[PDB]
Amino acid sequence: KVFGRCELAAAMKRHGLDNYRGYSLGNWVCAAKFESNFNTQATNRNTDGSTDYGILQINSRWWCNDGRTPGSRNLCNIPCSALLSSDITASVNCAKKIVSDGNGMNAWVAWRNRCKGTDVQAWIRGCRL
Numbered sequence: 001k002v003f004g005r006c007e008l009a010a011a012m013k014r015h016g017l018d019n020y021r022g023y024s025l026g027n028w029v030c031a032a033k034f035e036s037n038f039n040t041q042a043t044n045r046n047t048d049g050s051t052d053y054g055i056l057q058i059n060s061r062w063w064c065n066d067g068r069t070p071g072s073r074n075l076c077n078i079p080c081s082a083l084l085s086s087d088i089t090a091s092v093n094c095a096k097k098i099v100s101d102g103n104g105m106n107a108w109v110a111w112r113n114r115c116k117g118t119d120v121q122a123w124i125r126g127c128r129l
């Protein structure tokens with residue numbers, strides 16, 4: 001599923017991401033924009049053999065099981081395929097664990113490089129939320 005900007009903001013708020021760990025909804029929408037272009041089915045293979053899955057490009061080396069990332073963990077206790085669903089529940093629940101791991105949203109390198117410090121409120125501007 002390719003979400004619209006405000007559609008994804010509303011789904012993220014519905015699932016308790018707005019201001020989760022202090023990160024406003026615009027931060028989450030901005031991260032999703034540059035990680036996946038709002039596409040739940042986005043996947044991207046990393047140099048190390050791990051793979052990033054879903055709207056927030058959650059990585060198989062720590063967070064989900066894809067059966068093909070040697071030495072990895074599955075800390076969200078989910079198959080990585082669950083991160084590709086049109087329903088974003090699994091991605092949101094896992095992202096809550098990631099953002100709580102110590103480094104906040106810096107775990108998403110695209111958030112650090114393209115959202116952090118910017119006018120992230122623009123990402124939810126005009127949305128009925």
Ligand SMILES: Cn1c(=O)c2[nH]cnc2n(C)c1=O
Pocket residue numbers: 062075101
């Ligand atoms: C060492 N290490 C990490 O580097 C890491 N990165 C993300 N989760 C992590 N966990 C749980 C971890 O133990």
